[PDB]
Design a protein around this ligand. Structure first.
Ligand code: 766
Ligand code: CL
Ligand code: CL
Ligand code: MG
Length: 213
């Protein structure tokens, strides 16, 4: 089996069904004590929680589900009727994410999409009935943060006040994305310095609030 399957099995055997906080704790324990994995982790997760609570978004898009850790983290804080769409290009990890969300009891809040962001973003309006997004969490290929931000704007998916929140802007890093949003009058940016998941290595989240054209 794979590391991702071991993480799912550990949640199933060490968390409580229907209890998202137990699921997060189980994943963080496994990834601290057994095998590192690229979940956002609790350090950066606590900053995400604070941002989600500030904005109470009704419709969130996540680029890069992995095993569903960030999807559980965000979906557990959504208000009744609010929704998360999460894109995952690896079909094995899409299946693990769906199972993780089922276990946590969050499956009615989340739609896990299996494909590439450049293919799926242009289908959001017609196929998934999206008007505009309230928040976007970027956690997929680091060289796609910038092109997919521009693709979201082209597709008319951003509105004044849409919150982009970007993982890993320091490690592995997303230098073109940061330079772009920080230099653009169309974004209001804030950096939240933190640590790479499970490691004593500096990383950070970038919040970039879209201001219209
Ligand atoms: O690569 C990372 N995440 C991206 C996986 C991209 C897969 C997808 C592409 C795609 C396209 N379209 C739709 C959905 C998707 S999902 C990543 C890597 C590290 C890391 C790795 C080694 C290291 F030494 C230090 C940090 C830490 C992290 O927190 C990460 O997030
Ligand atoms: Cl994650
Ligand atoms: Cl952590
Ligand atoms: Mg990440």
């Amino acid at each position: 089996d794979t590391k991702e399957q071991r993480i799912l099995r550990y949640v199933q055997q060490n968390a409580k069904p229907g209890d998202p906080q137990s699921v997060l704790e189980a994943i963080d324990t496994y990834c601290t004590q057994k095998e590192w994995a690229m979940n956002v982790g609790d350090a950066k997760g606590q900053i995400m929680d604070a941002v989600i609570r500030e904005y109470s978004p009704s419709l969130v898009l996540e680029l890069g589900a992995y095993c569903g850790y960030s999807a559980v983290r965000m979906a557990r804080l959504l208000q009744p009727g609010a929704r998360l769409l999460t894109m995952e290009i690896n079909p094995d990890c899409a299946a693990i994410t769906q199972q993780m969300l089922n276990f946590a009891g969050l499956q009615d809040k989340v739609t896990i999409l299996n494909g590439a962001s450049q293919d799926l973003i242009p289908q959001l309006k017609k196929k998934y009935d999206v008007d505009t997004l309230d928040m976007v969490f970027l956690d997929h290929w680091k060289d796609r943060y910038l092109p997919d931000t521009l693709l979201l704007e082209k597709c008319g998916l951003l509105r004044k006040g849409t919150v982009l929140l970007a993982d890993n802007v320091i490690v592995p890093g997303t230098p073109d994305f940061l330079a772009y949003v920080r230099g653009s009058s169309s974004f209001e940016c804030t950096h939240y310095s933190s640590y790479l998941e499970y490691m004593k290595v500096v990383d950070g989240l970038e919040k970039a609030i879209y201001q219209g054209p």
